[PDB]
Design a protein around this ligand. Structure first.
Ligand code: FDA
Ligand code: FDA
Ligand code: FDA
Ligand code: 2H5
Ligand code: 2H5
Lengths: 576, 576, 90, 90
């Protein structure tokens, strides 16, 4: 390990990888530290779903997701177990057990909130949905000039999209995809527009999709290498970053204290620029552990010296979920253009169509696929081919339906994976609502209890706000009920429901961006720089100050591209 | 990819890795193919449990195991879902859905049987318990000479033990381990001997254990490299091996037909020597699809051309399981030697013991750990330290208790992990029975139905035989209930029970060894050579022909070592 | 119409369930594969426990039940007694 | 008549039940018939059903009824966990 860097990045997630790509590219000497390790194969921080085996057994990936989702704050446990043998050691109290947080009020939690500690962060398992925010969900980067703000955002998002390889055609030939898309388009004709969920992904084959990841943004290989001889990068995995160190005048970061988890060694790392991209929870944790904001249970009669808005105004989306079983009607429509004579299983059976007939309801590629499934698998009662890709349908957030929609198949299922209904019938529904930023919704850190890595235990104090949030959330549940009925009835076991607060993992605002610290109640300016500090920057969904329903990672990434612009304007790469 | 190699190995499990370490070591130009991919990090085929994060959160590791166990044979589902919406598409029959096997009788299955397709195979998630078999459990390698046979086994097991880094002292300094060990020793004094489970593992720190894997056996790196400049090895992952091609005379294999899962291309690979180490199911699958045994539902009217015992005489172990909550008596006994000075949390509070005191019931290392824990955590009502390593206790298989026993903490829990009861109180009990090999017990493959890799679908026809196996299983359950009661009462939610058949993954005998194909009803000789064929070898628990209780991996390894001794003598490495 | 039940209205479900005898229960095909290998174990899904083997479980009224007590189903019903409008009426 | 284990965490004063009931077209093919070989608990010909809600109006109304319930109930309160909207066993 070296001593002096131009730039140090904490976290090797997609946002840390954005800083790495911009800055390593522009010639900065860069170190990146991650508390987690490389486990996802030779491509470092790559999507764990990009194995042939997972994509042939997609029901199984849920387990990978669960295995690397460590809950953020688990209230103390009060379940009554009163059928222990009387010789068994039994508690008198519900005492602090199994890593639980005794600070946590179980009724004001985001109990589904969880973090992932591996190289590549959550991008080694995410769904890859990368929508842009429209204006209503999105912070301003230029005020009083909408066209300049829009134009800035378009430029940022267009770059972010090329980093993620975001596209909207990777499922264009799915029968199930088009079944639902065409149906929804017809039903809502001229009230809402549907399209492919934009996905960070490239299709390799009819049966395999390369899902994007941190790795796609930046390959995390150490440089100089053969392919980058003039670049300087080093990744230090299994290194826990603990504190940034402030100068006396609170105007500069002097160093970063780390703990090497293998050797157990501690160092102070010196850099020109300090970049924090450890996730919306752990960025806050690190900053709070370095004298920013207020350690311990909020106490207003002890106002913070620095960043009084840190861990306030946090946002998490409401999530409603169901699955549906496709209607008899939609299923019969799959084969509307077919002429089926005789009986299945007999030498007399035939299934045929007229190629390029004006009145065919489906294109030739569809009917060809149906014909071949039906002829080659005459035992099967359904017209959908066995390896037909899943739906990937959305109507994006609009003011008259202010929620994000996914009508799709997610690898992260929420129950036992049911086996009695054919998966070809199944569609998932996930509507995400936006949450008003409210001061009283807080992420804070205990001054007594600590986590698995001996940092202050995160604690939530969260409720979905009264008024618009709660009303939109219920109007979103009902919308899901109304829309999904158009495709088929609910699947027993996946009835329409609100999911645990936090489960959707779109936490925002915990170190929020604004124009002005006091007047916008924020922690970083529009360059994502920390107020007061020449050389400390924060990257992530924690920066996002607005109420949004769409998946936030593309937006976080865009903000990180703008952050890099400022850094290249204000610090010089060391000579190589 | 080269076209011609000296030896080709199918599968990168510990057993394939045994053949590679011996043969690459001996100068042979070796290619290894695995259907699965490198997905464990920079140490190829290494144990997924060997990350700081998993050892800080061992509960979460159940999810990694689940995520790579893919059920072998799933019977057609006949659960009634009669609450669908009337608009939903609804079945008229229980048709073949979701990759279910319609050949499989659900009352004669190994429903818990699963396979793992990753580089390293199952050793990337296994428990690492590696005991030797006593004579009772073990195939003969020399007849009419017991002492010579014992000497041959002990020579093979000692080598096998170094390759895996097996040892019996990595948990020597765990309180819980010794709490359990000492009490069971005393309870069964003169009657049974208790010890640490032999574990393929090397302790690195008081809180970190490097579990062994295929990687420990052979690092799977391509050679020549710097550390081995004169050896020749190529690993090709994502390659489905489909067929060995037999010559017309059935005397020799002429090629291995592979399918590259990434490009889609198919190849014929040529080697002097071919080794199948794809697991007890998959080896059998590749054999059958190559013309050995009998494809399709067993048909005694058509006796097979080659290897009639293949897929017959299959063994899997009964497994009974519970968890216990440690007795009050035992938990009190953990602090027996301590002198306590008043009220915890208070000023008066002091905990001390007398090192070396002969009146002590426990060792100094024990008392220093309790003392330290009870002084730094006065809020805690238990005398066990928070990161005390888990128990790892066994009384090995014997005539008067013919079953292997494990009294420990397994990363594979079978239900939702519970959090009402402190994890320091819980001990798992797993007893494994031995199963007599019967002809009627079978693993066969459909001549119509294929798997996710478009290869013949495996199907079981199994029952635990009446007679000694059944009586010993029931006896085995009484014994777990009786023995476990001496430590604590059953944990609710893990009551004493028989686990689904096949869940314990100790399947043997599917391509079994013996001296003589007919008399011993077997598929390979004691060099693991397939009868009739000069250059075809099989590796794995598939070879073991006996009724055994202990974990088979180490035994299969030993057979593989013997097998490579034959190979080294009878084939010559190509010139470099 | 007991003081005890209208003071414990949740406990009445139990009285209902106590007198609803299912009309046609199809043969059970649930797989139980964790029996002790000594316990007597079925080779087939045979006719067990009053099940109706004539009954196709995918074309059932599985919830249909009957009550055999004087006063029949009126000893437990909810007492909703709307009139049918013409559209619903013979 | 409650259908699951009754929950105890939410105050009952807050709880409201929603039951909507659809009409079914009478169709010849929907039968209640009786075995000539199997018998019930009182030695009478065992009842056997052959039923499915008719496609068409009956089916369409039933889905729409589900949606109506979802839409209506939202006006009063969100769904109680454990009692999510569902079609009951026929
Ligand atoms: C788990 C999950 C997440 C997403 C989706 C699916 C599921 C099941 N779906 C998805 C998401 N969002 C997208 O917009 N859309 C999709 O459809 N998911 C969210 C997305 O996954 C995250 O927003 C994104 O990765 C965040 O990027 P990041 O801000 O770079 O944060 P990460 O958590 O990914 O990476 C942080 C990183 O830092 C580490 N760490 C944490 N603490 C420390 C300390 N103290 N020192 C050093 N390193 C630290 C981690 O280990 C980690 O890699
Ligand atoms: C998953 C499991 C495994 C065991 C225990 C715990 C759990 C949860 N713990 C345990 C084990 N056994 C022991 O002796 N003691 C324990 O403490 N478990 C089982 C053990 O893990 C296995 O017995 C052992 O690995 C067997 O090794 P192997 O014979 O080399 O077989 P593997 O299945 O590990 O590796 C085979 C390998 O081949 C591949 N493959 C399969 N088919 C093909 C084809 N057609 N072409 C190419 N490659 C193929 C795989 O992908 C794989 O890696
Ligand atoms: C159980 C139940 C049923 C009703 C509701 C709720 C509950 C859980 N709620 C409800 C009812 N219907 C209303 O319109 N509104 C409500 O709000 N329920 C249904 C109502 O309960 C029935 O519709 C009504 O009783 C039917 O009346 P019935 O034609 O008089 O028939 P019953 O089934 O009540 O009583 C018949 C009776 O005959 C006997 N029996 C049966 N077989 C024989 C033979 N072979 N020999 C002699 N006697 C026989 C019985 O034992 C019984 O007492
Ligand atoms: O809860 C599952 C969801 O979680 C998120 O974080 C993703 O953005 C969604 F696309 C979806 O997979
Ligand atoms: O089912 C869990 C078991 O899996 C077997 O294969 C192992 O050998 C046992 F040690 C235990 O982990």
């Amino acid at each position: 390990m070296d001593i002096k860097y131009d730039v140090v990045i904490v976290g090797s997630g997609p946002i840390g990888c954005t800083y790495a790509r911009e800055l390593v590219g522009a010639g900065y000497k860069v170190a990146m530290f991650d508390i987690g390790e490389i486990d996802s194969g030779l491509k470092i921080g790559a999507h764990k779903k990009n194995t042939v085996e997972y994509q042939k057994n997609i029901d199984k990936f849920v387990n990978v997701i669960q295995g690397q989702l460590m809950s953020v704050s688990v209230p103390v446990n009060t379940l009554v177990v009163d059928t222990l043998s009387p010789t068994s050691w039994q508690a008198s109290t519900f005492f602090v057990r199994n890593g639980s947080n005794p600070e946590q009020d179980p009724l004001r939690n985001l109990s589904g909130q969880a973090v992932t500690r591996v190289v590549g962060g959550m991008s080694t398992h995410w769904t890859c949905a990368t929508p842009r925010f429209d204006r209503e969900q999105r912070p301003l980067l230029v005020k009083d000039d909408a066209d300049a703000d829009d134009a800035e955002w378009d430029r940022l998002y267009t770059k972010a999209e090329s980093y993620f390889q975001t596209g909207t055609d990777q499922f264009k030939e799915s029968i199930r995809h088009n079944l639902v898309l065409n149906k929804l388009t017809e039903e809502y004709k001229g009230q809402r527009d549907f399209q492919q969920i934009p996905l960070a992904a490239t299709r390799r084959s009819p049966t395999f999709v390369e899902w994007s990841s941190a790795n796609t943004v930046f390959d995390l290989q150490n440089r100089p290498n053969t392919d980058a001889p003039e670049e300087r990068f080093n990744l230090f995995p299994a290194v826990a970053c603990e504190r940034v160190v402030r100068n006396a005048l609170n105007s500069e970061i002097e160093s970063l204290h780390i703990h090497d988890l293998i050797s157990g060694d501690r160092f102070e790392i010196k850099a020109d620029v300090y970049v924090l991209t450890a996730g919306a929870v752990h960025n806050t944790q690190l900053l709070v552990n370095s004298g920013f904001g207020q350690l311990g249970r909020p106490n207003p009669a002890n106002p913070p010296e620095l960043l009084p808005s840190l861990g306030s105004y946090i946002t998490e989306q409401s999530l409603v979920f169901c699955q549906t079983v496709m209607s008899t009607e939609l299923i019969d429509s799959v084969k509307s253009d077919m002429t089926i004579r005789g009986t299945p299983g007999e030498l007399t059976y035939s299934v045929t169509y007229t190629p390029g007939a004006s009145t065919n309801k489906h294109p030739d590629w569809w009917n060809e696929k149906v014909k071949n499934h039906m002829m080659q698998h005459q035992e099967d009662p359904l017209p959908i081919p066995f390896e037909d890709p899943e739906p990937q349908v959305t109507t994006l957030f609009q003011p008259s339906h202010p929620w994000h929609t996914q009508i799709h198949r997610d690898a992260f299922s929420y129950g036992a994976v049911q086996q009695s209904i054919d998966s070809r019938l199944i569609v998932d529904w996930r509507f995400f609502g936006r949450t008003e930023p409210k001061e009283e919704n807080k992420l804070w850190f205990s001054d007594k209890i600590t986590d698995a890595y001996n940092m202050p235990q995160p604690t939530f104090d969260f409720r979905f706000p009264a008024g618009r949030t709660s009303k939109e959330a219920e109007d979103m549940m009902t919308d899901m009920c109304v829309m999904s009925a158009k495709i088929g009835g609910f699947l027993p076991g996946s009835l329409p429901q609100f999911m645990e607060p936090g489960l959707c993992l779109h936490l925002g605002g915990t170190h929020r961006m604004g124009f002005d610290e006091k007047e916008d109640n924020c922690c970083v300016n529009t360059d994502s720089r920390v107020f007061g500090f020449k050389n400390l920057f924060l990257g992530g969904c924690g920066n996002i100050p607005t109420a949004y329903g769409a998946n936030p990672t593309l937006t976080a990434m865009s903000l990180a591209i703008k952050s890099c612009e400022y850094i290249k304007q204000n610090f010089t790469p060391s000579p190589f």
